[PDB]
Write a protein that binds this ligand. Structure first.
Ligand SMILES: Cc1cc2nc3c(=O)[nH]c(=O)nc-3n(C[C@H](O)[C@H](O)[C@H](O)COP(=O)(O)OP(=O)(O)OC[C@H]3O[C@@H](n4cnc5c(N)ncnc54)[C@H](O)[C@@H]3O)c2cc1C
Ligand SMILES: Cc1cc2nc3c(=O)[nH]c(=O)nc-3n(C[C@H](O)[C@H](O)[C@H](O)COP(=O)(O)OP(=O)(O)OC[C@H]3O[C@@H](n4cnc5c(N)ncnc54)[C@H](O)[C@@H]3O)c2cc1C
Ligand SMILES: Cc1cc2nc3c(=O)[nH]c(=O)nc-3n(C[C@H](O)[C@H](O)[C@H](O)COP(=O)(O)OP(=O)(O)OC[C@H]3O[C@@H](n4cnc5c(N)ncnc54)[C@H](O)[C@@H]3O)c2cc1C
Ligand SMILES: Cc1ncc(C[n+]2csc(CCOP(=O)(O)OP(=O)(O)O)c2C)c(N)n1
Ligand SMILES: Cc1ncc(C[n+]2csc(CCOP(=O)(O)OP(=O)(O)O)c2C)c(N)n1
Ligand SMILES: Cc1ncc(C[n+]2csc(CCOP(=O)(O)OP(=O)(O)O)c2C)c(N)n1
Ligand SMILES: [K+]
Ligand SMILES: [K+]
Ligand SMILES: [Mg+2]
Ligand SMILES: [Mg+2]
Ligand SMILES: [Mg+2]
Lengths: 585, 585, 585
């Protein structure tokens, strides 16, 4: 006749297909804990060592599977620790439910221990943000939170006074609306608009197709359009892998977490097809300053004309639209623009390979990443932290449509490497999972290496130990007048940290050590997590946004210094290739 | 060459097709004022007498036309006065841009005169809420605010430091994205779900179709489905008029701003098709406690299964889905359920007509509304305030698809009568416009009667003067132990208020006075606004939510008392008609 | 035994001595209404016609008496209407309790009618901002709100789910802490700091004492210090009347709501004693750019050195410190600086008298204010709206320590005239009360003229009808490139508005009409409210911040034009008087 309200809440989560959720208990959330305890055979609580890791892992769950991620924190400090993960979910627009403990309704507003008005804490981050005040409606409030988080692709937060989940409510009244769930309708491309878009693209002298993760279902179409029309491809960094990196007309991404060919080509392009893309550097970097026509395809009206004025804007699904373009075009001959870009890409890839292929000497990030490539399965998943690793992984990982990679794309919170890998291994136990992290980022969430151990999650953790916030040191080099500050720090031996949490580990500092250590790690990670602490040099990775290679633009001295510092003696500027094929820069 | 940033901002508004905008100047917004002053031919500034009326009028603009409404207020108190209209826009989910003055950037954060951090003021109400800090990006920020308000169907607020719009910016850089704006092309309604939904509806013994304003494009289909299938129609109050009130199987709305036949039928129905509907009383009133199967059609995933456990919920457009159902069904013969409902409606309408058709004696609301109907053009627009007028207008106005009516549907702010009528006449100068308001609500925004005069907007204002907050008095009668309080007050003669603002007006207190006064008003309003102050009795309108007519449910004494108080001697309960056609209650 | 929680709440208000409170009922606050209804003998509920007037009146109660003001609004729009008065209370740092209705706990978070999370609405304005969730603790939460509002001199807001006040709670448990309330006993002003401050002040060649309302208890000391030491006095505008306006060495206030002698002297002064003063124009106007030494006395550490670099800042009570200074000084002979200032003041007052003393012709603000002075009792209270009236009243009213005057000092919300006068008459039924308001501000709250009638509050309302937002028109003249906009509008006849609310009234447009109309009004207001609508010219009042009188600073042409426009042919610049008594400018 009755059910505990907390039991009904857990049943709502189960109806919505939640397999696992993260948090740390406290008195103020012990009645939800009690309900979880009874349901342990049907829904799986993962106890993390810091609640930020639970929030980041919930966000990562949703990034990976599209299923709402679920986390919780106890009253006060338990919940405020969630923040970096909740802001990640908001900014990366993925559904997350966060439950926050609160004192019982009989003590709220008494200024009792750790008791505060918690609702204003979450107002900014959350799409939906409510304090529950009744047990009978609590299942509905949770259901509402989930349904809104999905519909609005963001964070729903419910503060739950601890007395409510221990109250009996009528067993027959509550329900979940999971049964009724659907994903948003996919809008269709207007036929005439797409024909006009196609005509403009085909009349271009120096076209590019520039896609983001909105085109994640359209890899086949992107690559075929590129091949058929002889139009190079470039992407946002997160969209790496949608088209295989091997594809010879894939230029990479622009700006800083970027590849040289993409920056150079974008500056020359006359027509850009911007599809499923919300590149946040568009305006501030003047990326499209010299673009003649700008063609946009996006499913979200809020994005149409956002990043540059459009000449044709199509409010439609990327794959449907790109398919419709492909269906109305035929094979075109090579052009000078096409060949200049192909040559530039080959030159760039030879540079990257030269860095990877060193066989002995002081270890650099580049060889560590080659060693990752050498042990990587074709459907591996990469959880990447924030810093130089985004830049280096973007250049060196050899991804295909079978891979996934995630980071904190826009909020760019450090520390996500560890939680993202925890989430990945929970969702895909049979796929290989890497955590690629700098030392600064790994430090921030290091304690949750213990969580990988506790749940026997066989992540391959690779820490890039430069004893620096390298990404920031380079920024200070670029902007600051006075000496470096806060960017070089003491060593932490992550192989000893790993030992401390009872994880097998290695530390390496020479290129020649890589093959055997990575082979051992590959094997250990058939059953248990492992960590490789790669002590790397302080070499700055080549700044794709600050090239000094073209004599029409840089002094011979600056060019020589750039080539020496970046081992870039064999890199040519795009203008070399433009000139070979008869085009002006 | 250069342009003032303020001039560019006004050009962004013009690009988006903003015809008119409302506000009151102040030093802190005088640079936007300056830009408006140069653009009088292309954009029409309406100076209101209180900023809440500007905000409510902006919301009403969007309710009526679907185009973003625009309002502003000066720093501090100018902007906080907008709140009731901004919350109306949020809750009625219509796009509104609000500009808020702010001190110049050189004095912000100095604690100078009327200078405060204004951003937190608007955080709750707004979908987008930013303080501008640069002139060159100001046109983009306004463009972004508009594009988000439309995309997210809510309020965008921009706080503008007064120095920025007077700064020169490059003439060639700014743009508006109005040219990208479009509406989505949707796929066909999900074929197999619609077919299954149809079977469940047709199998029902006591079906109802219960629609809201999400079905605004589907009036034809709703009426044809009803006629063909012999299924009565009911609606939310705001959806009155989508199907003509005359339609014999239109039951009205449920709850309190409601009609008897709808409440009675809903309690008996076995299957409800809930279409384009977010009825907020669903759960609290247990409206669907008896319903066996609950079927839904809605465009928004956030609504699927929201208001009741839903057997089939189709994510689709209402009109397309209802047309798809109509295309797969055909004539059903009249059923007892159909005939019982027809009879019940006829009885109810006879009751309402008996109230309307009194010819002499103390004036009641009922005859005032009959007099409105007698002078109303077939495409009249009605701006309705908040209180008993919603209840009475819902019962008595004879609307068709050619009419529009608006109120504050969900936030339910009093005072909207006046601003809604201002907005209606500005958008539709050739259509007759009424403002129907209680004395309490008309009092709140009375000063803006002067705005109708100043802009020669020929609104027909009808004030229902009962010297009460009648809607609240009746609530106190129902719930309060102690004497009435705050609900009966001293007369205001609105004909004298009208005279004070130089508007022609009349005061009436007898039924026999109505025809000549309403004829005069109809004629005056060919050229100028007019006000009729109708002094009405304190009679409580029949409570459709507290019927005492069925001898199986209520004592003879209770029924006799109800019939006496509400002049309802000839009303029969639905059970009488159910029994007449051979159905149990 | 038990008590209704609402009844206990009202007993908490009574314990704290709340005489009267303002608001408008609604379903969502009807349980508090019910408790008020049983307690009419002990607490007096004032039903206003717009909730902003309730909030502004609550703030004014606290401004006048130092006792917490209390207001309420129903859920949603009832409460958001409070905002302009709540922000006034925050910015004028006076204690106010605001109660906000909310849906019952069983329907919160169901998205039911007018139900929303109300807590974020009030977060910015409020010192304390909570949603009650339990009946038994509700009296404590109200008690806490009051105690914090007083302690922190600001707004406490409590959102009350309507079910709670109708629940029984144990009669013996609740209490109020009013019995604990007291004011602190402070140590002596810091002896050595006061002695040093005194030496610096006395060593000055061109000293000024510049006080604000923190010196409200120190009028006697200020005047005696000035007389004994031959140091002129100037004040903030709100501190007008602390020293009688008649005092020959009272210079007035600085900036725009200002008097010529204060602006001129401040620019020359070498030492300023800044007492109980938080003048918000200090930095933006560079008021103290020439000042050699800046001395401060303030009670609040947050103010020490805030407005200018301060040589000596004494943390102490103003009256005690000024008395301590007086006790260690003695007579100084008249100085040239003193004599120059006396002469300057005399010249200025002759100018103002020349404006006042016109006997016939087109009515200006100046003569209306003379007529006010002629009927004013010596202990009159003035509620002043926002606009030119601040400027004109500051110049023309002849105040003494027996008067009070209030406006919205810092938030500067228009519309406060009416509510401030309502509050004044409720607190002081035996004192004469004026509401001095511009037409724009009176328009905003005009409906609450009916509240004066309903409660028989004999306010003398004087509306200055220029058919402009004059204060803003003059700003546009000064800053705007393009034509005036939004600042000139259509007449409202407030004598007819008054007739509509059943208040006796007069409209005048000629100087010679004033004496008889003001005498009639004075007599009417022995028993009932009255309104005088004074139709005044559009003449710009002399801008004290833009003087053109000194031939060393301004061209002869500029001076001739200034003298012509402002009827200022006989005003002399301060330099004339400085030279007369042998000082350089
Ligand atoms: C340290 C760091 C540095 C970085 N720097 C760079 C950098 O230098 N260069 C770089 O490229 N990135 C960089 N990023 C990432 C960057 O911040 C942005 O997140 C990224 O550029 C945006 O990628 P996106 O447009 O693919 O994704 P999103 O911003 O998520 O946009 C997706 C777009 O697709 C649309 N969409 C979604 N579904 C569909 C559909 N079915 N059809 C059509 N449209 C659809 C959406 O409406 C949206 O507009 C960095 C990240 C980190 C952590
Ligand atoms: C004083 C007062 C009292 C009131 N009391 C009552 C009352 O007793 N009874 C009553 O009925 N109303 C009442 N109301 C109104 C009530 O508060 C709600 O606003 C109303 O019932 C909801 O109407 P709705 O569902 O039509 O509109 P909305 O709440 O706006 O919902 C529209 C729905 O349609 C969907 N939709 C939109 N477009 C489409 C599309 N193209 N296809 C499909 N779906 C779509 C939306 O997603 C949404 O779910 C009152 C109003 C006032 C002022
Ligand atoms: C339309 C309009 C225009 C205006 N323009 C002007 C203008 O041009 N000129 C002008 O002068 N005003 C003007 N004002 C008012 C202005 O905004 C400020 O409110 C005012 O100048 C500040 O006055 P104050 O310092 O007396 O009061 P507050 O700002 O309230 O400061 C009081 C100070 O006294 C201190 N204090 C309190 N008690 C004690 C104690 N016992 N002992 C010692 N210190 C104590 C406080 O800590 C505080 O620092 C205008 C108002 C309006 C409505
Ligand atoms: C939590 C957090 N703090 C600070 C930053 C700013 N930030 C971005 S990159 C970076 C340096 C990352 O250092 P590390 O993880 O060591 O990577 P490296 O660049 O040295 O390989 C910092 C501090 C951030 N994004 N997130
Ligand atoms: C601004 C605002 N304040 C209060 C309410 C609560 N409320 C809803 S109906 C009503 C009474 C309306 O009175 P009136 O306009 O005179 O209409 P009547 O019911 O007397 O016809 C009130 C106070 C509200 N919705 N909006
Ligand atoms: C509610 C509000 N809106 C706008 C302002 C900005 N403002 C300050 S003075 C003023 C004009 C006041 O006009 P009126 O009351 O007619 O006085 P006048 O200057 O004409 O005598 C305005 C709009 C304000 N302070 N408060
Ligand atoms: K940590
Ligand atoms: K008003
Ligand atoms: Mg590092
Ligand atoms: Mg009324
Ligand atoms: Mg005026």
């Amino acid at each position: 006749t009755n059910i505990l309200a907390g039991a009904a809440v857990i049943k709502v989560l189960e109806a919505w297909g939640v397999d696992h959720l993260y948090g740390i208990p406290g008195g103020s959330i012990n009645s939800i804990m009690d309900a979880l305890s009874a349901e342990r055979d049907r829904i799986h609580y993962i106890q993390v060592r810091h609640q930020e890791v639970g929030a980041m892992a919930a966000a990562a769950d949703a990034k990976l599977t599209g299923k709402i991620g679920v986390c919780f924190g106890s009253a006060g400090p338990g919940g405020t620790h969630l923040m970096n993960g909740l802001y990640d979910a908001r900014e990366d627009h993925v559904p997350v439910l966060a439950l926050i403990g609160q004192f019982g309704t009989t003590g709220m507003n008494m200024d009792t221990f750790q008791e505060m008005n918690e609702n204003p804490i979450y107002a900014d981050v959350a799409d939906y943000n409510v304090t529950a005040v009744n047990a009978a409606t609590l299942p509905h409030v949770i259901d509402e939170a989930i349904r809104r988080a999905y519909a609005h692709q963001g964070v729903a937060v419910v503060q739950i006074p601890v007395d409510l989940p221990w109250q009996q409510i009528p067993a027959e009244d509550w329900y979940a609306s999971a049964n009724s769930y659907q994903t948003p309708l996919l809008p269709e491309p207007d036929v005439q608009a797409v024909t006009r878009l196609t005509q403009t693209l085909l009349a271009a002298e120096r076209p590019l197709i520039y896609y983001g993760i909105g085109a994640r279902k359209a890899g086949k179409e992107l690559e075929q359009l590129s091949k058929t029309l002889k139009i190079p491809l470039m992407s946002t960094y997160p969209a790496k892998g949608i088209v295989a990196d091997r594809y010879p007309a894939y230029l990479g991404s622009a700006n800083r977490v970027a590849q040289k060919p993409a920056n150079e080509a974008l500056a020359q392009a006359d027509v850009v097809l911007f599809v499923g893309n919300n590149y946040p550097f568009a305006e501030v970097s003047k990326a499209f300053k010299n673009t003649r026509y700008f063609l946009q395809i996006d499913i979200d009206p809020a994005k149409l004309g956002k990043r540059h004025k459009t000449d044709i804007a199509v409010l439609a699904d990327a794959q449907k639209t790109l398919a419709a373009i492909l269906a109305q075009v035929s094979e075109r001959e090579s052009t000078p623009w096409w060949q200049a870009n192909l040559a530039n890409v080959k030159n760039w890839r030879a540079y990257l390979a030269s860095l990877e292929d060193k066989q002995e000497g002081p270890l650099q990030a580049y060889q560590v990443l080659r060693a990752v490539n050498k042990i990587a399965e074709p459907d591996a998943i990469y959880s990447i932290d924030v810093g130089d690793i985004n830049l280096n992984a973007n250049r060196h990982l050899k991804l295909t449509p079978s891979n996934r990679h995630i980071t904190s794309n826009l909020f760019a919170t450090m520390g996500v490497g560890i939680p993202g890998a925890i989430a990945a291994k929970l969702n895909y136990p049979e796929r290989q999972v890497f955590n690629l992290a700098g030392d600064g980022g790994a430090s921030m969430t290091m304690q949750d290496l213990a969580t990988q151990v506790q749940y026997h999650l066989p992540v391959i953790n690779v820490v890039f130990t430069n004893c620096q916030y390298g990404f920031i040191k380079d920024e200070q080099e670029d902007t600051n007048q006075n000496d470096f500050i806060g960017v070089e720090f003491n060593d932490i031996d992550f192989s000893k940290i790993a030992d401390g949490v009872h994880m097998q580990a290695f530390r390496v500092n020479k290129i020649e050590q890589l093959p055997d250590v990575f082979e051992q790690a590959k094997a250990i990670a058939q059953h248990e997590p492992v960590l490789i602490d790669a002590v790397i040099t302080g070499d700055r990775p080549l700044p794709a946004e600050k090239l000094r290679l073209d004599s029409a633009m840089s002094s011979a001295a600056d060019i020589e210094a750039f080539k020496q510092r970046y081992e870039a003696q064999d890199l040519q500027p795009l203008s070399t290739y433009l000139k070979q094929f008869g085009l002006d820069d």
